[PDB]
């Protein structure tokens, strides 16, 4: 029953979710001028090289890209981390509009698309149980804006046509997620949450200041999916973000000057 309309949006989910209102929601605007430079913060590490995808999925709210996290293949750490954290799945929250589509904001500046890479505190052994601890998630979030294209992102782009609707899953294997990854690993970073349903307040936030460019052509693909299931009215999967919330007794930590 939550999506992102009018009657079932942002503004209704406090109602199934009452954490929705609480202290420590994602997203955020990231205000580059209060955030603290933290010189004792580490460089985020990210071993991609043994990743391996499995599956896309449209579940109706965005798209999962899913890998296999049954061994330690494809890890976070290090930054603002303690121990080890296993990449799960990414997804894309994305515009009507070129002018807005992100979910964090940097100094109310929104950016065309964000990109989640999801990961699980591997001392709490899978994903369900993760979400169930303040310290469960780590998700790294990348800005795309519009301009020249990310090679990286078309073997995505090109397979959405197969996963139009509500349900639809393909197979999904070979892709190598350090394609999405901009040059700098420079990053801002606070507790926060899911940012969909449930709202579980698990998370620790990995906002790299670098942007990814693609390319109109690769934005216009994402706004062709369809929020519905097959055989029901189309409604275009466009405007999946929530808007930021309160920063309530948090400071966001900058990993650079
Ligand atoms: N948008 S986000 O904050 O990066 C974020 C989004 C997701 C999604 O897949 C959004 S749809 C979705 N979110 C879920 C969260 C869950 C879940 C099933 C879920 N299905 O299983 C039980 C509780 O956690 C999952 C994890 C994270 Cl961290
Ligand atoms: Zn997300």
Same mark, same amino acid.
């Given at each position: 029953?939550?999506g992102?309309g009018? =009657?079932?949006?942002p $503004?209704?989910? =406090?109602?199934?979710?009452p954490?929705?209102?609480?202290?420590?929601?994602?997203? /955020?605007?990231?205000?580059? =001028?209060?955030?603290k430079?933290?010189?004792?913060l #580490?460089?985020?590490?990210?071993?991609?090289?043994?990743?391996?995808?499995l +599956?896309?999925?449209?579940?109706?709210?965005?798209?999962?890209?899913?890998?296999d996290?049954?061994?330690?293949?494809?890890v976070?750490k *290090?930054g603002?981390?303690?121990?080890?954290? +296993?990449?799960?799945?990414?997804?894309?929250?994305?515009?009507?509009?070129d *002018?807005?589509?992100?979910?964090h904001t940097?100094?109310?500046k929104?950016?065309?698309?964000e990109?989640? @890479? /999801?990961?699980?505190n591997?001392k709490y052994?899978?994903?369900?149980?993760? %979400?169930?601890?303040?310290?469960?998630?780590?998700?790294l979030?990348?800005?795309?804006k519009? *301009?020249s294209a990310?090679?990286?992102?078309?073997? %995505?782009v090109?397979?959405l046509?197969?996963?139009?609707?509500?349900?639809?899953?393909?197979?999904?294997?070979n892709?190598?997620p350090?394609?999405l @990854?901009? $040059?700098?690993?420079?990053?801002?970073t606070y507790?926060?949450s899911?940012?969909?349903?449930?709202?579980?307040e698990?998370?620790?936030?990995?906002?790299? #200041?670098?942007?990814?460019s693609?390319?109109?052509?690769q934005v216009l693909?994402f706004?062709?999916?369809?929020?519905?299931?097959?055989?029901?009215? $189309?409604?275009?999967?466009v405007?999946?973000?929530?808007?930021?919330?309160?920063?309530?007794?948090?400071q966001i930590?900058?990993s650079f000057?």
């Amino acid at each position: 029953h939550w999506g992102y309309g009018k =009657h079932n949006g942002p $503004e209704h989910w =406090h109602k199934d979710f009452p954490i929705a209102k609480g202290e420590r929601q994602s997203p /955020v605007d990231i205000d580059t =001028h209060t955030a603290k430079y933290d010189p004792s913060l #580490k460089p985020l590490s990210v071993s991609y090289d043994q990743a391996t995808s499995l +599956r896309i999925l449209n579940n109706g709210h965005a798209f999962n890209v899913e890998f296999d996290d049954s061994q330690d293949k494809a890890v976070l750490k *290090g930054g603002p981390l303690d121990g080890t954290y +296993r990449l799960i799945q990414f997804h894309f929250h994305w515009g009507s509009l070129d *002018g807005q589509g992100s979910e964090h904001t940097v100094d109310k500046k929104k950016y065309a698309a964000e990109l989640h @890479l /999801v990961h699980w505190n591997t001392k709490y052994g899978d994903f369900g149980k993760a %979400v169930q601890q303040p310290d469960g998630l780590a998700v790294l979030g990348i800005f795309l804006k519009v *301009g020249s294209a990310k090679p990286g992102l078309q073997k %995505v782009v090109d397979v959405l046509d197969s996963i139009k609707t509500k349900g639809k899953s393909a197979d999904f294997t070979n892709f190598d997620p350090r394609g999405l @990854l901009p $040059e700098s690993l420079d990053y801002w970073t606070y507790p926060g949450s899911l940012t969909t349903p449930p709202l579980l307040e698990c998370v620790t936030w990995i906002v790299l #200041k670098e942007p990814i460019s693609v390319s109109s052509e690769q934005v216009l693909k994402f706004r062709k999916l369809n929020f519905n299931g097959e055989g029901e009215p $189309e409604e275009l999967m466009v405007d999946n973000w929530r808007p930021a919330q309160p920063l309530k007794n948090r400071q966001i930590k900058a990993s650079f000057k």
